[model samples]
Target: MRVGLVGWRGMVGSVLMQRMVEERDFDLIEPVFFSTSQIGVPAPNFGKDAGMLHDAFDIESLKQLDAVITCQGGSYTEKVYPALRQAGWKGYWIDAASTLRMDKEAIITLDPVNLKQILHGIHHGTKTFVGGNCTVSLMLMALGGLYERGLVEWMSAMTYQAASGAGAQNMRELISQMGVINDAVSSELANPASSILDIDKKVAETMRSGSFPTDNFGVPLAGSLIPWIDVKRDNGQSKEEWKAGVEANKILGLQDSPVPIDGTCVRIGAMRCHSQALTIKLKQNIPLDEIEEMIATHNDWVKVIPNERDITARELTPAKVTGTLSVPVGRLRKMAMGDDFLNAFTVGDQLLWGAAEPLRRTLRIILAE
Candidate 1:
């Protein structure tokens, strides 16, 4: 099968290419790079035959491919997806954007959490599959064990998301801010007249009101936390938070009987992995060991780290999971609220399982069928 990749030069697209070329997932498909700009330029060589980039405007060539995967943000997908359908292109279309997610024709891909829903869409001839938001996908990957078996009744999550979740530019801005803050702290402390108390106030002020670049994330994100992501809705939930429950329901095949999910998404200084503090209310009282076993064994990608102290080290952070697909979960214990309540923490590489892997696996499933 021939596969056309739109926005193959983007961060998410680059990761997708890594999975296809470096990791060799779905290597059976012939890879073609399509771009809005840099047409006819030499696309990055994945294999011996890295060819010239194709013009994205050439709808005729796109229609010829067996499948097309896109990561060119929402507006691009909104404009192009409808055009492809209007032009009678019948091939599969997969998107890594939020625009078409709730569309009647598109299915959100979360195979481990909702393989049944995916299969239903496939057998019913739904051609478009959308990737979930990074935070939502990462949460489900860690919590799918209880969700899959209807063990979870409700969930409340608090996310400390990394800079990369915003995009490549924001990640750099965060690093820049961190460097500036450290320098400010060092310079402040070097003065013999400055007290430790004064330095703490200065650092906190620098983190919040500092002139550090805010263009990428729309606010200062380094040395400070932004308690918002996407946009805020009337109900006081950020778009990311609102989408979590809605999309999780759709993917978990719980549209009619949805699970209750509410959370605050805060932007932090980390680079790639998204971490969540989750408290779940279960339908039944399961032992702590059983919950651990269920999460660890639910899927090969979900790993359980029982030692609470282990996560304190740098080795278990997003930096470690950046290039891998593992979603490491730890700190499982009973909540003081009730016997049915459990609390845990999980971290996942937003680029891998959170974004690219879902699109890659969906294509593989289509091929296998």
Candidate 2:
């Protein structure tokens, strides 16, 4: 199984490389690195051997591979995929972009949530499989236990997403802002008369005045929050919100319609791991203990933290969960508003299960056949 990895130096692509190495996926899929600008460069320790990176422009050469997993963002996928199809390549194409997800020709796959459907698509000759949004995938991974059991009737998700979801540059800018703010706070702490509130105001003012890198998030995200992500639709839902529901429906196999999912996606100072606060309404009244049991026993990747002390409390944050595959769920309880209402918080590595692992796992699953 010859595989071509496009955008091999990107953030998501880096995670893909890590997973491929850890799983020894190269034993089956001998990966060749492909890039738009880094051709003729040496990709050391790639796949089973040191390989030379090739340019993606060589369509004739790329057509010889069995599969291509791309993290080159939307425009590159859009520009290249059609040409590959036009070149009469019969191999599979996997994408980590929003452009091809909604297309009838593409399959948005999340195997852990809907493996059977993914296999069905493969058997039925669907060539393209797209990855879902980071927040949506994380939300479902934590709550999929209830969703599959017909326990979830509605889900209202509010995500505190990491800056890394935008790209590596955004992560750098977030760290830069954090470093500046920390130094400012330290300076203010030395003077007992200075209020911490004043330092916050100073940082906020500086960021708002364009003293920070606001190009990626389009707003000051360090000491503030942006209630929107991606472009806004005519119906007032942002692209991130709208596409999440569309892909969730397809991945969860909700053929009736898209689920009742609506919320804001905020970019936070965290470098990775997207965290979500969920308020779920269930069709039936299931006990809180039972719900906790269901999620704990559902899968190995989803961990339940019941203790509310500092150890468990601190474990729920992105700083603790980043670089790990487990989706940690905590702060679970019955909402005071109603008997059927349940509230929970979850955190997971955005680049792992959210983006790269699904593509890698799908490739393994397909090759096993």
- Count of clashing residue pairs in every prediction: 0, 0
Q: In model 2, which regions exceed 4 Å deviation?
A: 192-201, 307-309
Off by over 4 Å in 1: 187-194, 208-210, 310-316
Highest TM-score scorer:
2
The global Cα lDDT (0 to 1) of model 2 is: 0.83
* Most lDDT-accurate candidate: 1
lDDT tens digits, residue span 19-128, model 1 = 87765754577878898876888876777464888888787878888899998888888778888889998889989988988988899998988788899888898999
Q: Model 1, poorest ten-residue lDDT window?
A: 307-316
TM-score of each: 0.93, 0.94
Kindly list the per-residue Cα lDDT of model 2 for residues 23-73, writing each as its tens digit: 988788677888777678886574467478888878887898899999888
Number of colliding residue pairs in model 2: 0
